Amino acid sequence: IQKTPQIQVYSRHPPENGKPNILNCYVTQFHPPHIEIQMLKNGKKIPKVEMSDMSFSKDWSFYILAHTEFTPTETDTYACRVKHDSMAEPKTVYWDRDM
Amino acid sequence: GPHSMRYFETAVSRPGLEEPRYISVGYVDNKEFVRFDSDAENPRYEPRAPWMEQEGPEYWERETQKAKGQEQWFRVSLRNLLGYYNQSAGGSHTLQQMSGCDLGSDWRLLRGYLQFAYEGRDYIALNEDLKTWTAADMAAQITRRKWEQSGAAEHYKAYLEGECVEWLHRYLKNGTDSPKAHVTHHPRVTLRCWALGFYPADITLTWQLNGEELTQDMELVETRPAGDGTFQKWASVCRVYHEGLPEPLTLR
Amino acid sequence: KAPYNXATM
């Protein structure tokens, strides 16, 4: 059976403008493992995105962690775009400094 | 305290290539410390940990030779399983294996694990006794009859009770952050309790202003990694319980 | 140390 990914984007620290940080894109609960992940910065993809090795959870579904260091600014938006078989088109999730 | 070791092996056949891709990842105390990937420069077992780099050259040669063995083992079974389920060419399939030892404070084994899964679903598993097998599909009956007639359990039991618990001890003799919490006040009002920068992922949040725990609504997210060896978690609707905490936190 | 399976499936 195939499982659509669960994507969630979040910061390491609570974002304050002027401070380094890590932007995270956590993709979980998917199957089969073949998946494409890209992090966006105002629609432009972020190069040099260190991404976790892939392991799988106790329910056998796969998860993978996408993260990059960054310094957030209050006008710019960051997003994560994910490509999987179980989805028609790629799904994009925007980071919000809220919750 | 309590410790553990695990090996998550994965093999995926894809329509388009002849040999399936095989990955093996090792974990000491739920932290990755070594990996193998048949898609690499030329595949081998590389360290993924700071404290693992001091292993002898003979160590990586035996481990890489074993991974070549598992690779083939996964290539044959993957072909065997197409027949057990009357599948034909054209699809993608996954065989997964999870093995490891949980040992306790006395440094003796508590429970070993040996479990397989096909197409993400359970296939066959060594029980807690290490002697019998649990199989759910009728296709896995052929396998259980084969393995229990060829003494597989006793071999796996020898690894779990022997090599596993011995080497995990040697790994640990070569090498605990508590969470800082905040609460988000934003009215829509819903309250959110954040727990950040803790290790290990053992965390537990709760909402009781009236002294009673809450599960009506009370939206939670499961612990997720930060970009470094820590983890975070928040809860919606605040005592925070952690193994590093001498007393659970209180914030409102 | 990684395991090492005996009989195939």
Author numbering:
A (entry chain B): 1 to 99
B (entry chain A): 1 to 175, 182 to 194, 199 to 247, 259 to 273
C (entry chain C): 1 to 9
What does the paper say about this structure?
To assess the molecular bases underlying the effects of the l- to d-substitution at peptide position 6 on TCR affinity, we determined the crystal structures of H-2Db/F6f and H-2Db/V3P_F6f to be 2.6 and 2.4 Å resolution, respectively. As a result of the l- to d-symmetry, the side chain of p6f takes a different conformation in H-2Db/F6f compared to H-2Db/gp33. Interestingly, the aromatic ring of peptide residue p4Y, essential for recognition by the TCR P14, is profoundly affected by p6f and rotates clockwise from its conformation in gp33. The situation is very similar in H-2Db/V3P_F6f compared to H-2Db/V3P. The different spatial conformation adopted by p4Y and p6f in H-2Db/F6f and H-2Db/V3P_F6f complexes is reflected also in the reorganization of H-2Db residues involved in TCR binding, namely H155, R62, and E163. A similar significant decrease in affinity was also observed for binding of P14 to H-2Db/V3P_F6f compared to H-2Db/V3P (44 and 1.8 μM, respectively). However, the introduction of the l- to d-modification significantly reduced the binding affinity of the TCR P14 to H-2Db/pep complexes, even in the presence of the p3P modification. Our biochemical, biophysical, and structural characterization indicate that the l- to d-amino acid substitution at p6F in gp33 and V3P is well tolerated by H-2Db/peptide complexes, providing to our knowledge the first crystal structures of pMHC complexes including a d-amino acid.
Presentation of pathogen-derived epitopes by major histocompatibility complex I (MHC-I) can lead to the activation and expansion of specific CD8+ T cell clones, eventually resulting in the destruction of infected target cells. The interface surface that results from the combination of each peptide and MHC-I is key for recognition by the T cell receptor (TCR) on CD8+ T cells. More recently, Achour and co-workers also addressed whether vaccination with p3P-modified APLs would enable the tuning of endogenous CD8+ T cell recognition toward a viral immune escape variant. Our analysis also revealed that H-2Db-restricted peptides, likely due to the presence of two heavy chain tryptophan residues, force peptide residue 6 to adopt a suboptimal backbone configuration as also previously observed in multiple crystal structures.
